[PDB]
Assembly symmetry: C2
Homo-oligomer: 207 residues x 2
Amino acid sequence: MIVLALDVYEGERAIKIAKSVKDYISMIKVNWPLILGSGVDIIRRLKEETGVEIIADLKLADIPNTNRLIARKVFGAGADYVIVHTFVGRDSVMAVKELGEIIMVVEMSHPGALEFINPLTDRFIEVANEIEPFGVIAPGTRPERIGYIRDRLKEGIKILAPGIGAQGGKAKDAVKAGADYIIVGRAIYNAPNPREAAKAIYDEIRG
Amino acid sequence: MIVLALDVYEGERAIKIAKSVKDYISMIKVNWPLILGSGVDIIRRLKEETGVEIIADLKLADIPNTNRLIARKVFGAGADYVIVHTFVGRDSVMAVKELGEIIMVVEMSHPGALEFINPLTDRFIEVANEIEPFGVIAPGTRPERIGYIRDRLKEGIKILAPGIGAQGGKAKDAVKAGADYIIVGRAIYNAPNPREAAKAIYDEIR
């Protein structure tokens, strides 16, 4: 299953692309830049126009009440899932889960992640096991991490994996290693033919 | 110096309150809920209506490029400072600092902060010392934390302190202990007369 990181900051174009690839994706993921540029209502427009589930990749990291206010507005606009950090505490995570389904951050992909976040991943996975969110993200860059997380994560909690390599076999291998969803961005939205690009990835996964 | 936590989510009401208290505050701090309700342009409007600097309390905690995209848009809308987390790493902090002034989160005061954030406060202060942001936030629930952080924080970096008690002399003590700015919320924006409330706090601090 593919999660399209719809990082097309032109509202009308983003909606057109999402509608065109709907047949081959399971969810659309939106971020703060898109919400800032098009208004939070871009989420409702997308929900009404495509009927595809929406993940709001906000990586919420505020105090409980503020996380709650943000979640109320975003789930309110049509989001089905909100990505939240684990680092700020269980109360901040539960303030969001109270209003809708969540996906927790237990490990990150950038160089800075090695400073504080990744050394704590084992502990963050234990928190996710306690909370039982819909899922967690496993930087799919290098495979090993998908399996590493899967081996420590309670069954029932899904894994979404971004950063999959372009080599043939990489997407199917990520799923075989533990990824329930593959998060894809530019490979689809900036393709000459987004629908055919999504179909190609979908076909490898189901092949 | 007072930083108004303008946690009024109807933008025009936020503007009305901000305008009424502008002459007693140093900065206006806005958060995601206000930005989501009125649009990011509310930052430009608050600045135009009050002539006061704006802090965007976003607590950014994303990868460098996403932090950068958000910062570009928010500073572009008129923010003078952006609040960012330290825990996501130096590169994510610098991605924002390259576009405008930043304030770093090194400690929090909700119960959940005891799990992972607060045990790392000393280390986060050291990261702030190397980065040299405009300031850091020093939770004032426990007033002694202001002095604790000030002593360990590089000279030149400012401290903004929220959570100071309403008891007389407390805000003044916090300033004298090392807080350059006192962050005030409900005591001003939910007051019967926000302007008089702001003046009252301003006079107690001075």
